[PDB]
Amino acid sequence: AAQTNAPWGLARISSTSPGTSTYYYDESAGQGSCVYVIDTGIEASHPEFEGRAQMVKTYYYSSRDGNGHGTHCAGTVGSRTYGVAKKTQLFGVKVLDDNGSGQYSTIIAGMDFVASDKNNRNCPKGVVASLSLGGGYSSSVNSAAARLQSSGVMVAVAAGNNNADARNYSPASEPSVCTVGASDRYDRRSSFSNYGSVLDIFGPGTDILSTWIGGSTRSISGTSMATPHVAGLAAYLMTLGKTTAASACRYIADTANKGDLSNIPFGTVNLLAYNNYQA
Ligand SMILES: [Ca+2]
Ligand SMILES: [Ca+2]
Hints:
The active site is at residues 39, 69, 224. This protein is of the alpha/beta class.
Protein backbone atom coordinates (compact mmCIF):
# COMPACT_ATOMS: atom_id res chain seq x y z
CA ALA A 1 0.00 0.00 0.00
CA ALA A 2 1.08 3.58 -0.52
CA GLN A 3 0.07 6.85 1.06
CA THR A 4 0.93 9.78 -1.20
CA ASN A 5 1.81 13.20 0.26
CA ALA A 6 2.34 11.60 3.66
CA PRO A 7 3.79 13.46 6.67
CA TRP A 8 7.57 13.41 6.20
CA GLY A 9 8.14 11.11 9.20
CA LEU A 10 6.00 8.32 7.76
CA ALA A 11 7.70 8.63 4.38
CA ARG A 12 11.09 8.55 6.13
CA ILE A 13 10.50 5.25 7.93
CA SER A 14 9.65 3.56 4.62
CA SER A 15 12.67 4.92 2.71
CA THR A 16 16.42 4.37 2.71
CA SER A 17 16.92 8.09 2.00
CA PRO A 18 15.48 11.41 3.18
CA GLY A 19 13.35 13.68 1.02
CA THR A 20 10.60 11.33 -0.19
CA SER A 21 6.88 11.99 0.26
CA THR A 22 5.22 8.57 -0.04
CA TYR A 23 4.65 6.18 2.87
CA TYR A 24 4.93 2.56 1.71
CA TYR A 25 3.50 -0.12 3.99
CA ASP A 26 1.93 -3.56 4.03
CA GLU A 27 -1.89 -3.49 4.03
CA SER A 28 -2.08 -5.55 7.24
CA ALA A 29 -1.17 -2.24 8.90
CA GLY A 30 -0.90 -3.51 12.47
CA GLN A 31 -4.32 -5.17 12.49
CA GLY A 32 -4.58 -7.50 15.48
CA SER A 33 -2.01 -5.65 17.59
CA CYS A 34 -2.70 -3.28 20.49
CA VAL A 35 -0.85 -0.16 21.55
CA TYR A 36 -1.26 1.46 24.94
CA VAL A 37 -0.53 5.18 24.86
CA ILE A 38 0.36 6.22 28.39
CA ASP A 39 0.00 9.97 28.37
CA THR A 40 -2.55 12.82 28.82
CA GLY A 41 -5.33 10.70 27.34
CA ILE A 42 -6.76 10.26 23.82
CA GLU A 43 -9.60 12.10 22.13
CA ALA A 44 -11.15 8.80 21.06
CA SER A 45 -13.93 10.53 19.13
CA HIS A 46 -11.49 12.06 16.63
CA PRO A 47 -12.57 10.91 13.12
CA GLU A 48 -8.97 9.94 12.40
CA PHE A 49 -9.11 7.01 14.83
CA GLU A 50 -12.12 5.45 13.07
CA GLY A 51 -13.47 3.94 16.28
CA ARG A 52 -10.20 2.08 16.98
CA ALA A 53 -9.27 4.15 20.05
CA GLN A 54 -10.64 3.98 23.58
CA MET A 55 -9.78 5.21 27.04
CA VAL A 56 -9.32 2.37 29.49
CA LYS A 57 -7.98 4.10 32.60
CA THR A 58 -7.56 7.56 34.11
CA TYR A 59 -5.86 8.71 37.29
CA TYR A 60 -7.62 12.07 37.30
CA TYR A 61 -11.18 13.42 37.46
CA SER A 62 -11.85 12.78 33.78
CA SER A 63 -10.56 10.49 31.05
CA ARG A 64 -10.64 13.36 28.57
CA ASP A 65 -7.45 14.64 26.96
CA GLY A 66 -7.59 18.32 27.88
CA ASN A 67 -4.03 18.87 26.69
CA GLY A 68 -3.53 17.45 23.20
CA HIS A 69 -0.17 15.71 23.73
CA GLY A 70 -1.62 12.21 24.18
CA THR A 71 -3.92 12.58 21.19
CA HIS A 72 -0.97 13.71 19.05
CA CYS A 73 1.14 10.70 20.07
CA ALA A 74 -1.74 8.28 19.59
CA GLY A 75 -2.25 9.75 16.12
CA THR A 76 1.33 9.00 15.11
CA VAL A 77 0.91 5.41 16.31
CA GLY A 78 -2.35 4.65 14.61
CA SER A 79 -4.50 7.39 13.07
CA ARG A 80 -5.64 6.88 9.48
CA THR A 81 -3.73 9.77 7.94
CA TYR A 82 -0.92 10.43 10.40
CA GLY A 83 -0.25 6.95 11.77
CA VAL A 84 2.35 4.26 11.25
CA ALA A 85 0.08 1.32 12.03
CA LYS A 86 -3.22 2.39 10.56
CA LYS A 87 -5.32 -0.57 11.70
CA THR A 88 -3.99 -1.09 15.23
CA GLN A 89 -6.17 -0.84 18.34
CA LEU A 90 -5.33 2.09 20.63
CA PHE A 91 -5.83 2.11 24.40
CA GLY A 92 -5.47 5.31 26.37
CA VAL A 93 -4.12 5.47 29.90
CA LYS A 94 -4.20 8.97 31.38
CA VAL A 95 -1.29 9.29 33.83
CA LEU A 96 -0.56 12.94 32.96
CA ASP A 97 -2.82 15.84 33.87
CA ASP A 98 -4.09 18.41 31.38
CA ASN A 99 -0.98 20.51 31.93
CA GLY A 100 1.11 17.56 30.79
CA SER A 101 2.40 16.82 34.28
CA GLY A 102 2.25 13.83 36.59
CA GLN A 103 3.82 12.38 39.72
CA TYR A 104 6.09 9.39 39.44
CA SER A 105 3.80 7.28 41.64
CA THR A 106 0.97 7.74 39.14
CA ILE A 107 3.14 6.98 36.14
CA ILE A 108 4.33 3.79 37.83
CA ALA A 109 0.74 2.78 38.64
CA GLY A 110 -0.16 3.31 34.99
CA MET A 111 2.61 0.97 33.84
CA ASP A 112 1.63 -1.75 36.30
CA PHE A 113 -1.96 -1.31 35.15
CA VAL A 114 -1.04 -2.02 31.52
CA ALA A 115 0.88 -5.15 32.50
CA SER A 116 -2.31 -6.52 34.04
CA ASP A 117 -4.98 -5.06 31.74
CA LYS A 118 -3.46 -6.59 28.59
CA ASN A 119 -4.53 -9.98 29.93
CA ASN A 120 -8.17 -8.85 29.50
CA ARG A 121 -7.82 -7.75 25.86
CA ASN A 122 -7.91 -9.51 22.50
CA CYS A 123 -4.53 -8.61 20.99
CA PRO A 124 -3.52 -11.73 19.05
CA LYS A 125 -0.54 -10.14 17.29
CA GLY A 126 0.83 -8.60 20.48
CA VAL A 127 0.98 -5.58 22.77
CA VAL A 128 3.01 -2.34 22.67
CA ALA A 129 3.21 0.52 25.16
CA SER A 130 4.28 4.01 24.13
CA LEU A 131 5.64 6.34 26.84
CA SER A 132 6.31 9.86 25.62
CA LEU A 133 7.21 11.15 29.05
CA GLY A 134 9.98 11.26 31.59
CA GLY A 135 11.91 13.29 34.10
CA GLY A 136 14.96 12.97 36.31
CA TYR A 137 16.48 9.60 37.17
CA SER A 138 14.39 7.33 39.39
CA SER A 139 15.23 3.69 39.98
CA SER A 140 11.55 3.05 40.83
CA VAL A 141 10.37 4.43 37.50
CA ASN A 142 13.02 2.41 35.69
CA SER A 143 11.94 -0.70 37.58
CA ALA A 144 8.31 -0.22 36.53
CA ALA A 145 9.32 0.10 32.89
CA ALA A 146 11.41 -3.07 33.22
CA ARG A 147 8.42 -4.90 34.75
CA LEU A 148 6.15 -3.85 31.93
CA GLN A 149 8.66 -5.06 29.33
CA SER A 150 9.19 -8.32 31.24
CA SER A 151 5.43 -8.96 31.31
CA GLY A 152 5.44 -9.31 27.51
CA VAL A 153 4.80 -5.76 26.30
CA MET A 154 7.03 -3.96 23.85
CA VAL A 155 7.92 -0.78 25.73
CA ALA A 156 9.08 2.30 23.80
CA VAL A 157 10.13 5.40 25.74
CA ALA A 158 11.26 8.92 24.87
CA ALA A 159 14.94 9.74 25.29
CA GLY A 160 14.10 13.25 26.52
CA ASN A 161 14.55 16.77 25.17
CA ASN A 162 17.51 18.11 27.17
CA ASN A 163 20.30 17.76 24.57
CA ALA A 164 22.04 15.69 27.23
CA ASP A 165 23.00 12.12 28.07
CA ALA A 166 19.80 10.17 28.63
CA ARG A 167 21.49 8.21 31.44
CA ASN A 168 20.21 10.85 33.85
CA TYR A 169 16.54 10.55 32.89
CA SER A 170 13.77 8.02 33.52
CA PRO A 171 12.40 5.81 32.18
CA ALA A 172 14.80 6.62 29.29
CA SER A 173 17.77 5.17 31.17
CA GLU A 174 16.25 1.72 31.75
CA PRO A 175 18.29 -0.48 29.45
CA SER A 176 15.69 -3.23 28.92
CA VAL A 177 13.16 -1.02 27.13
CA CYS A 178 13.45 0.72 23.75
CA THR A 179 14.78 4.25 24.18
CA VAL A 180 14.04 6.55 21.25
CA GLY A 181 15.85 9.69 20.09
CA ALA A 182 14.57 12.25 17.56
CA SER A 183 15.73 13.23 14.08
CA ASP A 184 14.65 15.92 11.63
CA ARG A 185 13.68 15.83 7.98
CA TYR A 186 17.26 16.42 6.85
CA ASP A 187 18.54 13.40 8.81
CA ARG A 188 20.11 15.46 11.57
CA ARG A 189 19.75 14.58 15.22
CA SER A 190 17.02 16.90 16.48
CA SER A 191 18.73 19.78 18.25
CA PHE A 192 16.89 19.02 21.51
CA SER A 193 17.24 15.25 21.43
CA ASN A 194 19.03 13.45 24.24
CA TYR A 195 21.77 11.03 23.23
CA GLY A 196 24.07 8.51 24.85
CA SER A 197 24.83 4.81 24.98
CA VAL A 198 21.39 3.91 26.33
CA LEU A 199 19.63 5.05 23.14
CA ASP A 200 18.44 2.14 21.02
CA ILE A 201 17.08 3.86 17.96
CA PHE A 202 16.10 7.19 16.36
CA GLY A 203 12.79 8.13 14.81
CA PRO A 204 11.36 11.29 13.23
CA GLY A 205 10.77 13.93 15.91
CA THR A 206 10.96 17.46 14.47
CA ASP A 207 7.85 19.08 12.93
CA ILE A 208 5.55 16.08 13.17
CA LEU A 209 1.98 16.53 11.96
CA SER A 210 -0.63 14.52 13.82
CA THR A 211 -4.07 14.60 15.46
CA TRP A 212 -4.95 17.18 18.13
CA ILE A 213 -7.91 17.76 20.41
CA GLY A 214 -11.07 19.44 19.17
CA GLY A 215 -10.97 17.20 16.11
CA SER A 216 -7.99 19.12 14.76
CA THR A 217 -4.37 18.62 13.70
CA ARG A 218 -1.08 20.32 14.44
CA SER A 219 2.65 19.97 14.06
CA ILE A 220 4.88 19.78 17.13
CA SER A 221 8.41 18.59 17.97
CA GLY A 222 10.01 16.33 20.56
CA THR A 223 11.33 12.89 21.39
CA SER A 224 7.68 12.50 22.41
CA MET A 225 6.95 12.45 18.70
CA ALA A 226 9.69 10.04 17.71
CA THR A 227 8.61 7.44 20.28
CA PRO A 228 5.17 6.65 18.74
CA HIS A 229 6.82 6.17 15.32
CA VAL A 230 8.83 3.33 16.86
CA ALA A 231 5.85 2.02 18.87
CA GLY A 232 3.70 1.98 15.73
CA LEU A 233 6.50 0.32 13.74
CA ALA A 234 6.79 -2.43 16.36
CA ALA A 235 3.04 -3.07 16.22
CA TYR A 236 3.29 -3.19 12.45
CA LEU A 237 6.18 -5.67 12.50
CA MET A 238 4.56 -7.87 15.15
CA THR A 239 1.41 -8.16 13.01
CA LEU A 240 3.61 -9.25 10.07
CA GLY A 241 5.14 -11.91 12.31
CA LYS A 242 8.67 -10.58 11.85
CA THR A 243 9.35 -10.18 15.55
CA THR A 244 7.91 -10.47 19.07
CA ALA A 245 7.43 -8.05 21.95
CA ALA A 246 10.58 -9.32 23.66
CA SER A 247 12.86 -8.76 20.70
CA ALA A 248 11.21 -5.99 18.64
CA CYS A 249 13.61 -3.26 19.79
CA ARG A 250 16.58 -5.39 18.77
CA TYR A 251 14.95 -6.31 15.45
CA ILE A 252 14.21 -2.65 14.68
CA ALA A 253 17.86 -1.77 15.43
CA ASP A 254 19.11 -4.69 13.32
CA THR A 255 17.03 -3.64 10.30
CA ALA A 256 17.42 0.14 10.70
CA ASN A 257 18.98 2.57 8.28
CA LYS A 258 22.55 2.75 9.55
CA GLY A 259 24.86 5.77 9.40
CA ASP A 260 22.32 8.12 7.77
CA LEU A 261 22.15 10.64 10.61
CA SER A 262 24.42 13.60 11.28
CA ASN A 263 25.35 15.31 14.58
CA ILE A 264 25.44 11.98 16.41
CA PRO A 265 27.95 12.10 19.32
CA PHE A 266 30.55 9.31 19.46
CA GLY A 267 29.10 6.44 21.50
CA THR A 268 25.51 6.99 20.40
CA VAL A 269 23.99 4.63 17.83
CA ASN A 270 23.49 5.92 14.31
CA LEU A 271 20.31 3.97 13.57
CA LEU A 272 17.05 5.25 12.08
CA ALA A 273 13.82 3.24 12.25
CA TYR A 274 12.97 1.64 8.90
CA ASN A 275 10.18 -0.74 7.87
CA ASN A 276 12.08 -2.47 5.02
CA TYR A 277 8.95 -2.58 2.88
CA GLN A 278 9.24 -4.15 -0.57
CA ALA A 279 6.23 -4.25 -2.90
CA1 LIG B 1 20.50 5.89 3.58
CA1 LIG C 1 17.42 -0.56 25.43
